[PDB]
Amino acid sequence: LNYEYPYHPSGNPKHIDVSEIDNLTLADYGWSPDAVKAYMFGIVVQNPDTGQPMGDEFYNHILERAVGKAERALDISILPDTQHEMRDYHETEFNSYMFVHAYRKPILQVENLQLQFNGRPIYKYPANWWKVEHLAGHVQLFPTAGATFAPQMIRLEYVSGMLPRKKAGRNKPWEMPPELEQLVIKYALKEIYQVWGNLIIGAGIANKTLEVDGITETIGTTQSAMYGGASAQILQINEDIKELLDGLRAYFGYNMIGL
Amino acid sequence: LNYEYPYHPSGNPKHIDVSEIDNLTLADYGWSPDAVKAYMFGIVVQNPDTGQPMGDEFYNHILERAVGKAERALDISILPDTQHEMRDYHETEFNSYMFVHAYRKPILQVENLQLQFNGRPIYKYPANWWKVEHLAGHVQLFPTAGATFAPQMIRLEYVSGMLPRKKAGRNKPWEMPPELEQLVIKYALKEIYQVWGNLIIGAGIANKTLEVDGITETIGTTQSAMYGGASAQILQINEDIKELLDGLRAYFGYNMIGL
Amino acid sequence: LNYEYPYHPSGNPKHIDVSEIDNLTLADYGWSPDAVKAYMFGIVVQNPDTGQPMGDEFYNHILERAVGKAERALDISILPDTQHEMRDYHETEFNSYMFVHAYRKPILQVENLQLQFNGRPIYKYPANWWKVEHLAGHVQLFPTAGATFAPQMIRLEYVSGMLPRKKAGRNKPWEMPPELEQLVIKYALKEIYQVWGNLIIGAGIANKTLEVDGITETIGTTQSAMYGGASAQILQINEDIKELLDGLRAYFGYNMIGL
Amino acid sequence: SHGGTTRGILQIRSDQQQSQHALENFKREWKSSLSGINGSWQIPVVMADDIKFVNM
Amino acid sequence: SHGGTTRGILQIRSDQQQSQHALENFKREWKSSLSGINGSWQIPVVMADDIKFVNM
Ligand SMILES: [Zn+2]
Ligand SMILES: [Zn+2]
Ligand SMILES: [Zn+2]
């Protein structure tokens, strides 16, 4: 077999170039102001006195925080990033084919794996030994050929993250599921509805009547002393979030550790 | 290896200069009056009789207290600060590679570590022995080469805190998660909504009608004898806080100690 | 080492001069009428018949009692004061490096520590032996070199209290947390809202209508036979208090004693 | 030779599961305080919402 | 040599924990009435909202 050294085509196939991780952007995953606005078709958000529409800056801000919330809501790494870990030796798992669980998952690829002492490599494992399970976040060695623990013996460098899916409706284990995109959308949408729900009427108005010279107008509104103007949509979005998180917490597993 | 002495590049890499910790400010983390106002787009807070808008002083005041509340809500150190601890010897943990848990986390870097007697250094551990786990708040030694406890034997100097994140959507373990910023925002916003909710109408008005010379006006409002004018927004913000704190209390672990 | 005698720089560093404890005032901690008024921006409290505004005397009165309530709500000493204790000998804790828990915490500094008999010093411990843990309220000795209890053998003089914090957003263990200030504010604010909630309308009015010569006015109000005019704000302030006390009762620990 | 000798499962439960990083440094807090002869008589204090041990 | 021999925890519970001063003079009330041979057969009366002893 011949390959770019670390990327042995069975155990550690290359999925991204370490230059592309700088080139990828939120819009490449479909997280864009236009995508949010699409879910608010027929609505426009604008300053009631000034008339100017809300700018895309706030949309992108909200989207970046929605991605952060999604990355803590599921114990995952979404946008590609280079991770450098110093990991403890434990005898049970070191005996178990040098088992290590990465802090961040999925693994896009492993970049380096060494056993070291004060930064000196004691051994560098051949890349043909590296066994990677991308969605699990597991790395192992299968060698071709006085204490139960010690700190920071293992040095592991890898890329965590997901790539945008290459086919409609489908994703590989290292590609983003189609509806995690929609989950991040829904999180953005829930904040934008909170903004819009202030502006449908003047501040604090929950009923109005005006009568002048035999003309009468009277409006009841979705605002009230209990419920804000976008309560309903937020409730629905919360339902959708609940279903989405149920499904995605079935796709990613339960966390476990042996003590 | 060559390095600035304490900052051995494997065990204690330098993340901040001890001059920059004075230069960092709240606005560098995005906590600014403009950031709060953005979440109240289309609202303005102004004195009903005087017309003057509420000044940025109150915004910055509220933000500083929102940071304090966030630092107690999660057992964390947010803004960089230099911590000096005198720590007890305990035989079990001293035998466990000189294990010490810092009072404040994350560790940005360790500055000094000594075993002492009446302020006299008995031993100064080489910086190449220091093993730091930044997000955990753990420090250990891995030496290169009549009682179970005694008070204040170990002197530990370090910087605790978080740095502002360098990439969109991503944070290293020593960088602030994108939505802890939003949590501090939400805490500020919850007080500013309490202020604004007094001023939408005259004091104590919950309904009004005026009729003069065949013109009639009638307003119902979000105030009531139970609910204040911004009850709804505060409730929603409390929901968002609950979700954010759930996620962040999953990111930081459960506290534990052995007795 | 050279130092002002009691203030050995490792075990008992000096944090305040015993002259400054007289010079510190509530306004130095930010507890001021202006600080309360800021949280009631756009409101003014004034005698409905006399028109005169409520004086700062009542504000300072309320603030002093809010500090007293805060000092019992958390088992702490807030404003610096000199504490003189006569403490019992107990064999277990005297054997445990002369362990004593102070009645008041934090310790700013220890001023004197002696073993005595009818006021005669039997031994005065060298200040280089004193080990102080400020936030815990613990003092111990680490000597450099017929009954299980007896009354009032140990004489301990110290300063308890907190200093105003020196940096924004941050506090040392002997400095006041930024939101304990806000807790004392909220306690003051809760009484001032009870005062203001009487004056928004005439006494006992919960609805009014007046019609004269074809002009009609009609007002519904936040007063009712159940809820007072500021019920809502008081409820919200109670919520904020609950969150603040949760956080601060996590910062200070659970009380314990061995019998 | 082949069995599961595992005594039981320590169930800790809260509003959400810990991250893997949190759980691995909790494993370090555990082993540095409680393992072997060195830890043998210490007891951990834990303040989780509920703690259960299932005997298998 | 190293263990916790502690029999158990006496949990007393009320609307709020006692101050440290209150708790230390409760320790004095306790030891002056109940410790050693001198106290050996007396029983304390306590009127806390609930009292529990946890066997460890
Ligand atoms: Zn896993
Ligand atoms: Zn910890
Ligand atoms: Zn205590």
Automatic annotation (TrEMBL), chains A, B, C:
Keywords: Metal-binding, Zinc. Zn(2+) binds at residue 101. This is Neck protein. It comes from Staphylococcus phage 812. The lineage of its organism: Viruses, Duplodnaviria, Heunggongvirae, Uroviricota, Caudoviricetes.
UniProtKB/TrEMBL annotation, chains D, E:
Coiled coil: none annotated. It comes from the Viruses. Transmembrane segments: none annotated. Zn(2+) binds at residue 29. This is Portal protein. The lineage of its organism: Viruses, Duplodnaviria, Heunggongvirae, Uroviricota, Caudoviricetes.
